Design a protein around this ligand. Structure first.
Ligand SMILES: *[C@@H]1O[C@H](CO)[C@@H](O)[C@H](O)[C@H]1NC(C)=O
Ligand SMILES: *[C@@H]1O[C@H](CO)[C@@H](O)[C@H](O)[C@H]1NC(C)=O
Ligand SMILES: *[C@@H]1O[C@H](CO)[C@@H](O)[C@H](O)[C@H]1NC(C)=O
Ligand SMILES: *[C@@H]1O[C@H](CO)[C@@H](O)[C@H](O)[C@H]1NC(C)=O
Lengths: 354, 350
């Protein structure tokens, strides 16, 4: 509440300074400035060892930055485990979207794993030998560790740390059970006729038109924790079935997360690595409102597998401009928006149900 | 023109341990700033004059300003409005007085003038008909015949020494506070609900709760839920700053062991809500205490400190209000031994 800053205020036509609350868009910024780090690698190693002994065979990361943290500390955790004679290998793979919940939780260990004080030699520097027992973090590893035996949402941000090139975000294993997204990295603000619900992976803009409505959003992850109402604007009398970004995808439970003529986009292209929600026709396409249209269904891409653009689309009672998702492989339409003449079986469809 | 999600700036971020720049949303504390950097101005003095003239002809005899900034605007345009009215042969004089708190509602509304009228230096003779804005004028123009909340901010305008805020007479009837000048933000463990008169801080303890507030006006419009955090499951009787005093309808405007402070010292020109003992006093939680009543000041009218206070089931540190005349206690907190009849009490009920 007591940060000091200066800014160009475009809506108030002034450049000024003062104290206040400043919410930065670090989602769309090309500069990477935050890195997650364990509060204590030796304590995290002990939590992993205990988790494994309790039948927790791996991790489903909540967020893109958690997976990056696991990848950067993998070698260190394995060296600590080997230093203590623990036959266990942390194996960190890629994130797949959506980042589905797991039901287990890392335990808080009483003690960290200590230093071994082994003879001076290459063991202080080289990676640990691979073992028979893989503690798998994300990756394509469901056969060896099914999702129901993985821990998810076990961390809380303990503090931020100063750094010259990156700002550290220290993560600690929490004691409490929670489904909620970590509020330490959430920033939500409204000013005049625009608002943003944000964290390190979601930048969700709303605006006052005739009513408040979703304006645009950019998501560089697809997480499944619950966005906390404490950090959400205008939460009363909201119907979850009207929330554009579903609750089950960390959508804010807010009138700001709604748009007339659209219901919750549970079958959007949430397999995508990142998505922009934009109310605008896909390139080369037109949408027509007509009750004869097909019904809501899986989101469809505007281009076929061969690259052919589908020119004409419809929706039974949605509103213009149309809801679209912009992804690396092209432009996708809201669930309401179906091809007008083309069979849907010729198109690329979302296989995800959030 | 009205986009505020893409400002650019730099800041010292104490909780994230960084000084950095970027794009985003910046919510400034303009309440506790050293100066007024904003000035309300009518979008058109001549249009406002026409609205006043027609209002007078409809039996609206004056104005109750919604905000401190609106009253300052009326004072600045008074002479010009009266010149315009005199130029058009209208036997009417706008008379602007000071604001009293609370700035109570009125049920009338300025009309959007059907016919427009066809100056900054003219010294208009006073007429026999007074259109009174605020002031100690309730006898000649009762509250039930005054317009209130008739303006909407149309736009901001650049200025070297002050940023202009242009006000237009609105068509629609509303009780809502103008959202054009509201900023609300939460980041991590702290939040603020703010406009040009209220700075309301909340924090995450075991639960989210009111931390502190600074108010430089006491207004009575409704704080819009659109600009409010966490509005569901809220009991309005738990809102520390009452709904009827533009309190946000939020869990952030609550504090365990206190209910809504309808009889706080809202006649104050400015106040700080602070959870802290009044100087030289102690509060004991004990069931033998008196029940909730009008807020009492910690000092007698002659400045003597009442040392020992109690509450039946409030929480420590105690809810207090800091004003120019001293330190006042939340409704729950009563003198432990001294009779209340010896103390200074709030006479207002929000
Ligand atoms: C590791 O696994 C092999 C089988 O591939 C097994 O024979 C061996 O005993 C194991 N090593 C241990 C348990 O130390
Ligand atoms: C609302 O949005 C529509 C289309 O998105 C636009 O044409 C219209 O001007 C807007 N109305 C407002 C901002 O009052
Ligand atoms: C002026 O108003 C007073 C009432 O305050 C009235 O008694 C008087 O007759 C009026 N004089 C005029 C209209 O010349
Ligand atoms: C809550 O505030 C009290 C003081 O009122 C403080 O002692 C305590 O540490 C705080 N608890 C948390 C969880 O911040």
């Amino acid at each position: 509440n007591a940060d000091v800053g200066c800014s160009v205020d475009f809506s108030k036509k002034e450049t000024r300074c003062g104290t206040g609350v400043f919410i930065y868009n670090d989602v769309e910024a090309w500069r990477d400035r935050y890195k997650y780090h364990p509060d204590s690698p030796r304590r995290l190693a002990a939590a992993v060892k205990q988790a494994w002994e309790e039948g927790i065979c791996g991790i489903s990361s909540v967020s893109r930055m958690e997976n990056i943290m696991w990848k950067s500390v993998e070698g260190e955790l394995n060296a600590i485990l080997e230093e203590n004679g623990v036959q266990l290998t942390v194996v960190v793979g890629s994130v797949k979207n959506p980042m589905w919940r797991g039901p287990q939780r890392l335990p808080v260990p009483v003690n960290e794993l200590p230093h071994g004080w082994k003879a001076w030699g290459k063991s202080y520097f080289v990676r640990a030998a691979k073992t028979n027992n893989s503690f798998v973090v994300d990756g394509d590893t469901l056969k060896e560790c099914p999702l129901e035996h993985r821990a998810w949402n076990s961390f809380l941000v303990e503090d931020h740390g100063f750094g010259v090139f990156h700002t550290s975000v220290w993560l600690k294993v929490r004691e409490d059970y929670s489904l909620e997204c970590d509020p330490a990295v959430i920033g939500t603000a409204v000013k005049g006729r625009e608002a943003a619900h944000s964290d390190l992976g979601y930048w969700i803009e709303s605006e006052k038109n005739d009513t408040w409505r979703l304006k645009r959003a950019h998501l560089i992850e697809m997480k499944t924790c619950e966005w906390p109402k404490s950090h959400t604007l205008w939460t009363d009398g909201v119907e979850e079935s009207d929330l554009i970004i579903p609750k089950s995808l960390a959508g804010p439970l807010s009138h700001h997360n709604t748009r007339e003529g659209y219901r919750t986009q549970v079958k959007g292209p949430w397999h995508s690595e990142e998505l922009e929600i934009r109310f605008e026709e896909c390139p080369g396409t037109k949408v027509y409102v007509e009750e004869t249209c097909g019904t809501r269904g899986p989101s469809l891409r505007s281009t076929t597998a061969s690259g052919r653009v589908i020119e004409e689309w419809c929706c039974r009672e949605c509103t213009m401009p149309p809801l679209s998702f912009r992804a690396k492989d092209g432009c996708w339409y809201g669930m309401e928006i179906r091809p007008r003449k083309e069979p849907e079986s010729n198109l690329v469809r979302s296989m995800v149900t959030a």
